[PDB]
Design a protein around this ligand. Structure first.
Ligand code: 4A9
Ligand code: 4A9
Lengths: 255, 253
């Protein structure tokens, strides 16, 4: 039903490697993003399993599936995000100019997309800035390109991947936004992280970040997954942040 | 007259910050739990002078004051904090319409006294309402909230008890939406222009039409067409018998 011929697609510029992700034109008018599969690395039935997930999910804050190519090489066609990954965006030229009102709005958009995933009873399992795509007018959309520092302890240790383990990951994503794409738990290795978070270690409040936003991060990092907040609460809290939580917020040198 | 030495009060835990000072939880004479508030000294002490004249059960009661700088305005302690934080927090999901209407009835009672005393609050909203034990709500003042202010008070500075009624209508949306910011998606600029052309917030989800009609009565273009807090108090106290006798609890209200 979602099938289209290869003749309609024209791969123009390569964006990432691993298969690989391209920027092209569908039917010679619509600018699209094409994720190709390198044969041998993964079977076509296992690669199209991701598109099966995208067929059931439809929201303004999720990367929208456009079409699929069942003939090898396998193509998964989606909408094009002009600014790339949130991680590269935060690390790049734009990072210096982004302040807390922009970063909280981006966080509110991600929380909205994840609030849909919550309602649909789906689990992302790899929520991070690298899996968030940025477009025009600071539009952020939840994606998956295919991460112990971002994974909840029960999910990393006992494989208990839930929407509450995604909430934990969203808490880590908040540190990425407030540190301008810096890797969580700086100086700590994957083994050091897993053992310290069990003993109750949590990342301290990032510099220039208000305590109220770090409290929200700490709510996302509660040992008991059931005690963690919903993405519905996170969306509402982040949308209303500069009126209800920080009305006396003053811009600084970085945040 | 209300004066007490500095050695009596002890500031233990910081509750709030910003504005002119800070709200602190402490102990007065080492027996009773109190709240202490740390602009010219004559301007800050003027707030405590107003509190000396206002005495009501649904108003934060003034206990003591320190005249010389640094000034310490001592009041009663509200264990649950601001109504906004209370609604936004863990308690929000459990609060239904009978509780929220009872809370609104208590705020209307406090504001009914304010009305009788010919006083104007000027900043009535959930952030200036404090919650205690057994859902006791008391009117407070922590010191622009255009979304809560009436058009005549925002544009022409015509601050009255009728403009406080407008603010109470917005507070009713805060209660029924569980602390959500009014006029969602709208900025203070497009709020003033839309409200002037006649725009009013629609009925919140699961909220009865009868409570939205009361919100709209508080939001009448002509301030003298707005109801009294005495009417608002009586309407909310009798709500589940006179207005909604066949009310059934839902998923959120
Ligand atoms: C790597 C990259 N991608 C860019 N844009 C993209 N737009 C869409 C992309 C993409 O990954 N599309 C795609 C293709 C196939 C499948 C998928 N699926 C998903 O991402 C996916 C999978 C499962 C679930 C979900 C969801 F929504 F639930 F969370 C999503 C997504 S990648 C731009 C860019 N830029 C850097 C280069 N500059 C300059 C020009 O070269 C432009 C910005 N760099
Ligand atoms: C900010 C905050 N205040 C709390 N409790 C409070 N109780 C009283 C407070 C207070 O503002 N007291 C105070 C001190 C000095 C002056 C004033 N005055 C007024 O508020 C005032 C001034 C003028 C007029 C009016 C009136 F009534 F007409 F409207 C009122 C009030 S603040 C608790 C709390 N929390 C609840 C639990 N804790 C942790 C417990 O360990 C965290 C949050 N958070």
């Amino acid at each position: 039903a979602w099938e289209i011929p290869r003749e309609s697609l024209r791969l123009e510029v390569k964006l990432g490697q691993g298969g690989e992700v391209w920027m092209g034109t569908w039917n010679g008018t619509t600018r699209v993003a094409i994720k190709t599969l390198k044969p041998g690395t993964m079977s076509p039935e296992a690669f199209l399993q991701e598109a099966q997930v995208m067929k059931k999910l439809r929201h303004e804050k999720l990367v929208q599936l456009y079409a699929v190519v069942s003939e090898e090489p396998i193509y998964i066609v989606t909408e094009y995000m002009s600014k790339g990954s949130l991680l590269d965006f935060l690390k790049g030229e734009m990072g210096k100019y982004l302040r807390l009102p922009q970063l909280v709005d981006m966080a509110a958009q991600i929380a909205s997309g994840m609030a849909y995933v919550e309602r649909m009873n789906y689990v992302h399992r790899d929520l991070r800035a690298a899996n968030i795509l940025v477009g025009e007018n600071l539009v952020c959309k939840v994606a998956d390109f295919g991460p112990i520092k971002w994974t909840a302890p029960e999910a990393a240790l006992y494989g208990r991947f839930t929407i509450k383990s995604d909430v934990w990951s969203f808490g880590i994503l908040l540190t990425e936004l407030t540190t301008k794409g810096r890797v969580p738990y700086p100086g700590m290795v994957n083994r050091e992280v897993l053992d310290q978070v069990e003993r109750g270690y949590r990342m301290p409040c990032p510099p220039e970040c208000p305590e109220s936003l770090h409290d929200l991060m700490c709510q996302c990092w509660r040992k008991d997954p059931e005690e963690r907040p919903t993405f519905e609460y996170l969306q509402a809290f982040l949308e209303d942040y500069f009126t209800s939580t920080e009305p006396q917020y003053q811009p600084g040198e970085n945040l």
